[PDB]
């Protein structure tokens, strides 16, 4: 499913992402935007290390979900990577919450540093009523 901007914003709020571990909703929106373009079925194979990024937040199979084909991988979210490709983003959110409970927080995603950190991210949630 390709979410509309404000549709996703309101969905994330309902799922308790606003301010989760100090991360504002606009930051999560900035992250989803750059990681997948708000697309839940987005996948990206990293030929360099044999891992794959899954879903709206592009969560990596090496540590977060299990896809069976990633060498020496772990499954911290305790989910099949397929759960991160559903239209219902509940599981992806629960896993994103797990990721940020690690010390790096939102910084775990390199894209967030590149496109969101120290930027005016208000644009991602404006007019959405959140
Ligand atoms: Na994993």
Short mmCIF file of N, CA and C and ligand atoms in Angstrom, two decimals:
data_model
loop_
_atom_site.label_atom_id
_atom_site.label_comp_id
_atom_site.label_asym_id
_atom_site.label_seq_id
_atom_site.Cartn_x
_atom_site.Cartn_y
_atom_site.Cartn_z
N UNK A 1 0.85 -1.21 0.00
CA UNK A 1 0.00 0.00 0.00
C UNK A 1 0.88 1.25 0.00
N UNK A 2 0.53 2.21 -0.85
CA UNK A 2 1.25 3.47 -0.91
C UNK A 2 0.37 4.47 -0.15
N UNK A 3 0.78 4.81 1.07
CA UNK A 3 0.04 5.74 1.92
C UNK A 3 0.06 7.16 1.40
N UNK A 4 -0.98 7.93 1.71
CA UNK A 4 -0.99 9.34 1.36
C UNK A 4 -0.30 9.95 2.58
N UNK A 5 0.36 11.09 2.41
CA UNK A 5 1.06 11.73 3.52
C UNK A 5 0.29 11.85 4.83
N UNK A 6 -0.80 12.61 4.83
CA UNK A 6 -1.56 12.80 6.06
C UNK A 6 -2.25 11.54 6.60
N UNK A 7 -2.56 10.61 5.70
CA UNK A 7 -3.19 9.35 6.10
C UNK A 7 -2.20 8.61 7.01
N UNK A 8 -0.95 8.55 6.56
CA UNK A 8 0.10 7.89 7.33
C UNK A 8 0.36 8.63 8.65
N UNK A 9 0.41 9.95 8.59
CA UNK A 9 0.67 10.75 9.78
C UNK A 9 -0.36 10.45 10.87
N UNK A 10 -1.63 10.45 10.51
CA UNK A 10 -2.68 10.16 11.48
C UNK A 10 -2.60 8.71 11.98
N UNK A 11 -2.23 7.78 11.10
CA UNK A 11 -2.08 6.38 11.47
C UNK A 11 -0.95 6.20 12.50
N UNK A 12 0.20 6.83 12.24
CA UNK A 12 1.34 6.74 13.15
C UNK A 12 0.99 7.30 14.53
N UNK A 13 0.23 8.39 14.56
CA UNK A 13 -0.17 8.99 15.84
C UNK A 13 -1.02 8.02 16.65
N UNK A 14 -1.98 7.38 15.99
CA UNK A 14 -2.87 6.44 16.63
C UNK A 14 -2.09 5.25 17.19
N UNK A 15 -0.98 4.93 16.54
CA UNK A 15 -0.12 3.81 16.96
C UNK A 15 0.90 4.19 18.04
N UNK A 16 0.80 5.42 18.54
CA UNK A 16 1.67 5.89 19.61
C UNK A 16 3.10 6.22 19.28
N UNK A 17 3.35 6.67 18.06
CA UNK A 17 4.70 7.01 17.61
C UNK A 17 5.14 8.41 17.95
N UNK A 18 4.18 9.29 18.22
CA UNK A 18 4.50 10.67 18.51
C UNK A 18 5.25 10.84 19.83
N UNK A 19 6.55 11.11 19.72
CA UNK A 19 7.37 11.31 20.90
C UNK A 19 7.93 10.02 21.44
N UNK A 20 7.72 8.90 20.74
CA UNK A 20 8.22 7.61 21.20
C UNK A 20 9.75 7.68 21.34
N UNK A 21 10.24 7.43 22.55
CA UNK A 21 11.67 7.49 22.86
C UNK A 21 12.25 8.83 22.41
N UNK A 22 11.47 9.88 22.59
CA UNK A 22 11.90 11.22 22.24
C UNK A 22 11.84 11.61 20.77
N UNK A 23 11.29 10.73 19.93
CA UNK A 23 11.20 10.98 18.50
C UNK A 23 9.85 11.54 18.07
N UNK A 24 9.86 12.77 17.57
CA UNK A 24 8.64 13.44 17.12
C UNK A 24 8.04 12.76 15.88
N UNK A 25 6.72 12.87 15.74
CA UNK A 25 6.00 12.30 14.61
C UNK A 25 6.58 12.76 13.26
N UNK A 26 6.93 14.05 13.15
CA UNK A 26 7.49 14.60 11.91
C UNK A 26 8.79 13.90 11.50
N UNK A 27 9.55 13.44 12.49
CA UNK A 27 10.79 12.73 12.22
C UNK A 27 10.49 11.35 11.64
N UNK A 28 9.49 10.68 12.19
CA UNK A 28 9.09 9.36 11.68
C UNK A 28 8.58 9.51 10.25
N UNK A 29 7.85 10.59 9.99
CA UNK A 29 7.30 10.85 8.66
C UNK A 29 8.45 11.12 7.68
N UNK A 30 9.41 11.95 8.10
CA UNK A 30 10.57 12.25 7.27
C UNK A 30 11.30 10.94 6.93
N UNK A 31 11.43 10.05 7.91
CA UNK A 31 12.08 8.76 7.72
C UNK A 31 11.32 7.87 6.71
N UNK A 32 10.01 7.70 6.89
CA UNK A 32 9.20 6.86 5.98
C UNK A 32 9.25 7.41 4.56
N UNK A 33 9.23 8.74 4.44
CA UNK A 33 9.27 9.41 3.15
C UNK A 33 10.53 9.05 2.39
N UNK A 34 11.68 9.21 3.03
CA UNK A 34 12.94 8.92 2.38
C UNK A 34 13.29 7.46 2.26
N UNK A 35 12.81 6.64 3.18
CA UNK A 35 13.10 5.22 3.11
C UNK A 35 12.29 4.50 2.03
N UNK A 36 10.99 4.77 1.97
CA UNK A 36 10.15 4.06 1.02
C UNK A 36 9.19 4.87 0.17
N UNK A 37 9.06 6.16 0.45
CA UNK A 37 8.10 6.95 -0.28
C UNK A 37 6.71 6.56 0.22
N UNK A 38 6.64 6.12 1.47
CA UNK A 38 5.37 5.71 2.12
C UNK A 38 4.80 4.42 1.52
N UNK A 39 5.67 3.57 0.98
CA UNK A 39 5.25 2.32 0.35
C UNK A 39 5.55 1.12 1.26
N UNK A 40 4.50 0.41 1.67
CA UNK A 40 4.65 -0.73 2.57
C UNK A 40 5.25 -2.00 1.94
N UNK A 41 5.19 -2.12 0.62
CA UNK A 41 5.73 -3.32 -0.02
C UNK A 41 7.15 -3.13 -0.57
N UNK A 42 7.76 -1.98 -0.26
CA UNK A 42 9.11 -1.69 -0.72
C UNK A 42 10.14 -2.67 -0.13
N UNK A 43 11.02 -3.15 -1.00
CA UNK A 43 12.07 -4.07 -0.60
C UNK A 43 13.33 -3.64 -1.33
N UNK A 44 14.47 -3.83 -0.68
CA UNK A 44 15.73 -3.47 -1.29
C UNK A 44 16.81 -4.42 -0.87
N UNK A 45 17.34 -5.15 -1.84
CA UNK A 45 18.40 -6.12 -1.59
C UNK A 45 19.75 -5.42 -1.60
N UNK A 46 20.55 -5.68 -0.57
CA UNK A 46 21.87 -5.10 -0.43
C UNK A 46 22.81 -6.24 -0.79
N UNK A 47 23.19 -6.27 -2.07
CA UNK A 47 24.08 -7.30 -2.59
C UNK A 47 25.42 -7.36 -1.84
N UNK A 48 25.83 -6.23 -1.27
CA UNK A 48 27.09 -6.17 -0.55
C UNK A 48 27.23 -7.07 0.66
N UNK A 49 26.15 -7.22 1.42
CA UNK A 49 26.19 -8.06 2.62
C UNK A 49 25.11 -9.14 2.67
N UNK A 50 24.36 -9.28 1.57
CA UNK A 50 23.29 -10.28 1.42
C UNK A 50 22.06 -10.10 2.30
N UNK A 51 21.81 -8.86 2.71
CA UNK A 51 20.66 -8.57 3.55
C UNK A 51 19.62 -7.81 2.71
N UNK A 52 18.40 -7.72 3.22
CA UNK A 52 17.33 -7.03 2.53
C UNK A 52 16.61 -6.10 3.50
N UNK A 53 16.20 -4.95 2.98
CA UNK A 53 15.47 -3.93 3.73
C UNK A 53 14.00 -4.13 3.37
N UNK A 54 13.14 -4.17 4.39
CA UNK A 54 11.72 -4.43 4.19
C UNK A 54 10.73 -3.38 4.66
N UNK A 55 9.73 -3.11 3.83
CA UNK A 55 8.64 -2.21 4.20
C UNK A 55 8.78 -0.72 4.22
N UNK A 56 7.81 -0.10 4.88
CA UNK A 56 7.72 1.34 4.98
C UNK A 56 8.94 2.02 5.67
N UNK A 57 9.54 1.35 6.66
CA UNK A 57 10.69 1.92 7.36
C UNK A 57 12.00 1.28 6.88
N UNK A 58 11.88 0.39 5.89
CA UNK A 58 13.04 -0.29 5.34
C UNK A 58 13.92 -0.91 6.43
N UNK A 59 13.31 -1.79 7.21
CA UNK A 59 13.96 -2.47 8.31
C UNK A 59 14.81 -3.63 7.79
N UNK A 60 16.08 -3.66 8.20
CA UNK A 60 17.04 -4.65 7.73
C UNK A 60 16.96 -6.06 8.35
N UNK A 61 17.06 -7.06 7.48
CA UNK A 61 16.97 -8.46 7.90
C UNK A 61 18.14 -8.97 8.71
N UNK A 62 19.28 -8.28 8.70
CA UNK A 62 20.43 -8.78 9.47
C UNK A 62 20.22 -8.80 10.99
N UNK A 63 19.42 -7.87 11.50
CA UNK A 63 19.19 -7.79 12.95
C UNK A 63 17.75 -7.79 13.41
N UNK A 64 16.87 -7.22 12.60
CA UNK A 64 15.48 -7.04 13.01
C UNK A 64 14.40 -8.07 12.70
N UNK A 65 14.42 -8.63 11.50
CA UNK A 65 13.41 -9.63 11.16
C UNK A 65 14.11 -10.83 10.53
N UNK A 66 13.43 -11.97 10.48
CA UNK A 66 14.03 -13.16 9.89
C UNK A 66 13.48 -13.48 8.50
N UNK A 67 14.36 -13.59 7.51
CA UNK A 67 13.96 -13.98 6.15
C UNK A 67 14.64 -15.30 5.73
N UNK A 68 15.41 -15.89 6.64
CA UNK A 68 16.07 -17.15 6.37
C UNK A 68 17.30 -17.19 5.47
N UNK A 69 17.42 -16.24 4.55
CA UNK A 69 18.55 -16.23 3.64
C UNK A 69 19.68 -15.25 3.98
N UNK A 70 19.55 -14.51 5.07
CA UNK A 70 20.61 -13.56 5.43
C UNK A 70 21.62 -14.25 6.36
N UNK A 71 22.90 -14.30 5.96
CA UNK A 71 23.95 -14.94 6.75
C UNK A 71 24.14 -14.32 8.14
N UNK A 72 24.37 -15.18 9.13
CA UNK A 72 24.59 -14.76 10.50
C UNK A 72 23.69 -13.64 10.99
N UNK A 73 22.40 -13.76 10.69
CA UNK A 73 21.43 -12.74 11.07
C UNK A 73 20.69 -13.09 12.35
N UNK A 74 20.14 -12.06 12.98
CA UNK A 74 19.35 -12.24 14.17
C UNK A 74 17.96 -11.65 13.88
N UNK A 75 17.02 -11.90 14.77
CA UNK A 75 15.64 -11.47 14.61
C UNK A 75 15.18 -10.79 15.90
N UNK A 76 15.68 -9.59 16.16
CA UNK A 76 15.33 -8.86 17.38
C UNK A 76 13.85 -8.53 17.51
N UNK A 77 13.17 -8.29 16.40
CA UNK A 77 11.76 -7.99 16.48
C UNK A 77 10.91 -9.24 16.61
N UNK A 78 11.54 -10.39 16.40
CA UNK A 78 10.89 -11.70 16.47
C UNK A 78 9.68 -11.75 15.53
N UNK A 79 9.95 -11.42 14.27
CA UNK A 79 8.93 -11.41 13.22
C UNK A 79 9.53 -11.92 11.92
N UNK A 80 8.69 -12.52 11.08
CA UNK A 80 9.14 -12.95 9.77
C UNK A 80 9.22 -11.60 9.04
N UNK A 81 10.21 -11.43 8.15
CA UNK A 81 10.31 -10.18 7.41
C UNK A 81 9.06 -9.95 6.57
N UNK A 82 8.32 -11.01 6.28
CA UNK A 82 7.11 -10.85 5.50
C UNK A 82 6.06 -9.99 6.23
N UNK A 83 6.09 -9.98 7.57
CA UNK A 83 5.16 -9.18 8.37
C UNK A 83 5.37 -7.69 8.08
N UNK A 84 6.56 -7.34 7.62
CA UNK A 84 6.88 -5.95 7.31
C UNK A 84 6.46 -5.53 5.90
N UNK A 85 5.74 -6.40 5.20
CA UNK A 85 5.29 -6.09 3.85
C UNK A 85 3.75 -6.04 3.76
N UNK A 86 3.08 -6.05 4.91
CA UNK A 86 1.61 -6.00 4.94
C UNK A 86 1.10 -4.57 4.75
N UNK A 87 -0.17 -4.43 4.40
CA UNK A 87 -0.76 -3.10 4.25
C UNK A 87 -0.98 -2.54 5.66
N UNK A 88 -1.26 -3.43 6.60
CA UNK A 88 -1.47 -3.03 7.98
C UNK A 88 -0.07 -2.83 8.55
N UNK A 89 0.25 -1.61 8.98
CA UNK A 89 1.59 -1.33 9.49
C UNK A 89 1.84 -1.55 10.98
N UNK A 90 0.91 -2.20 11.67
CA UNK A 90 1.05 -2.44 13.11
C UNK A 90 2.35 -3.12 13.49
N UNK A 91 2.68 -4.23 12.82
CA UNK A 91 3.92 -4.96 13.12
C UNK A 91 5.18 -4.16 12.78
N UNK A 92 5.16 -3.45 11.65
CA UNK A 92 6.30 -2.61 11.24
C UNK A 92 6.55 -1.54 12.31
N UNK A 93 5.48 -1.00 12.88
CA UNK A 93 5.58 0.03 13.91
C UNK A 93 6.15 -0.55 15.19
N UNK A 94 5.66 -1.73 15.58
CA UNK A 94 6.15 -2.38 16.78
C UNK A 94 7.65 -2.66 16.64
N UNK A 95 8.09 -3.01 15.44
CA UNK A 95 9.50 -3.30 15.19
C UNK A 95 10.34 -2.02 15.13
N UNK A 96 9.78 -0.95 14.58
CA UNK A 96 10.47 0.34 14.51
C UNK A 96 10.69 0.84 15.95
N UNK A 97 9.70 0.60 16.81
CA UNK A 97 9.79 0.98 18.23
C UNK A 97 10.95 0.22 18.87
N UNK A 98 11.09 -1.06 18.54
CA UNK A 98 12.19 -1.90 19.06
C UNK A 98 13.56 -1.36 18.62
N UNK A 99 13.67 -1.01 17.34
CA UNK A 99 14.91 -0.47 16.79
C UNK A 99 15.40 0.74 17.58
N UNK A 100 14.51 1.69 17.84
CA UNK A 100 14.89 2.91 18.55
C UNK A 100 15.12 2.74 20.05
N UNK A 101 14.84 1.56 20.58
CA UNK A 101 15.10 1.33 21.99
C UNK A 101 16.60 1.04 22.17
N UNK A 102 17.33 0.91 21.05
CA UNK A 102 18.77 0.71 21.09
C UNK A 102 19.38 2.12 21.25
N UNK A 103 20.61 2.22 21.77
CA UNK A 103 21.26 3.53 21.97
C UNK A 103 21.26 4.57 20.84
N UNK A 104 21.45 4.12 19.61
CA UNK A 104 21.46 5.03 18.46
C UNK A 104 20.14 5.73 18.23
N UNK A 105 19.06 5.08 18.64
CA UNK A 105 17.73 5.63 18.43
C UNK A 105 17.42 5.74 16.95
N UNK A 106 16.83 6.87 16.57
CA UNK A 106 16.44 7.17 15.18
C UNK A 106 17.66 7.20 14.24
N UNK A 107 18.84 7.42 14.82
CA UNK A 107 20.09 7.47 14.07
C UNK A 107 20.46 6.12 13.47
N UNK A 108 19.75 5.05 13.84
CA UNK A 108 20.03 3.71 13.30
C UNK A 108 19.89 3.71 11.78
N UNK A 109 19.02 4.58 11.28
CA UNK A 109 18.79 4.70 9.85
C UNK A 109 19.68 5.80 9.31
N UNK A 110 20.62 5.43 8.45
CA UNK A 110 21.52 6.39 7.84
C UNK A 110 20.77 7.47 7.08
N UNK A 111 19.69 7.10 6.38
CA UNK A 111 18.89 8.07 5.64
C UNK A 111 18.37 9.23 6.51
N UNK A 112 18.02 8.93 7.76
CA UNK A 112 17.51 9.95 8.66
C UNK A 112 18.58 11.02 8.90
N UNK A 113 19.83 10.59 9.03
CA UNK A 113 20.93 11.52 9.23
C UNK A 113 21.09 12.43 8.01
N UNK A 114 21.06 11.81 6.83
CA UNK A 114 21.23 12.51 5.56
C UNK A 114 20.14 13.50 5.22
N UNK A 115 18.89 13.04 5.32
CA UNK A 115 17.74 13.85 4.93
C UNK A 115 16.85 14.48 5.98
N UNK A 116 17.02 14.11 7.25
CA UNK A 116 16.12 14.63 8.29
C UNK A 116 16.77 15.36 9.44
N UNK A 117 17.91 14.85 9.90
CA UNK A 117 18.61 15.45 11.01
C UNK A 117 18.93 16.93 10.79
N UNK A 118 18.65 17.75 11.81
CA UNK A 118 18.91 19.19 11.76
C UNK A 118 18.22 19.93 10.62
N UNK A 119 17.09 19.41 10.16
CA UNK A 119 16.35 20.06 9.09
C UNK A 119 14.97 20.42 9.62
N UNK A 120 14.29 21.29 8.88
CA UNK A 120 12.94 21.71 9.23
C UNK A 120 12.05 20.58 8.68
N UNK A 121 11.61 19.69 9.56
CA UNK A 121 10.78 18.56 9.15
C UNK A 121 9.29 18.81 9.37
N UNK A 122 8.94 20.03 9.78
CA UNK A 122 7.54 20.38 10.02
C UNK A 122 6.66 20.12 8.80
N UNK A 123 7.24 20.29 7.61
CA UNK A 123 6.53 20.10 6.35
C UNK A 123 5.85 18.73 6.19
N UNK A 124 6.44 17.70 6.76
CA UNK A 124 5.90 16.36 6.66
C UNK A 124 4.55 16.15 7.38
N UNK A 125 4.27 16.95 8.41
CA UNK A 125 3.01 16.80 9.14
C UNK A 125 2.05 17.98 9.02
N UNK A 126 2.44 19.02 8.30
CA UNK A 126 1.58 20.18 8.20
C UNK A 126 0.28 19.96 7.46
N UNK A 127 -0.79 20.45 8.08
CA UNK A 127 -2.12 20.31 7.52
C UNK A 127 -2.74 18.95 7.74
N UNK A 128 -2.03 18.05 8.42
CA UNK A 128 -2.56 16.71 8.65
C UNK A 128 -3.49 16.56 9.84
N UNK A 129 -3.53 17.57 10.70
CA UNK A 129 -4.40 17.52 11.86
C UNK A 129 -3.93 16.59 12.97
N UNK A 130 -2.61 16.50 13.12
CA UNK A 130 -2.00 15.66 14.14
C UNK A 130 -1.19 16.50 15.11
NA1 LIG B 1 16.88 -10.09 11.24
#
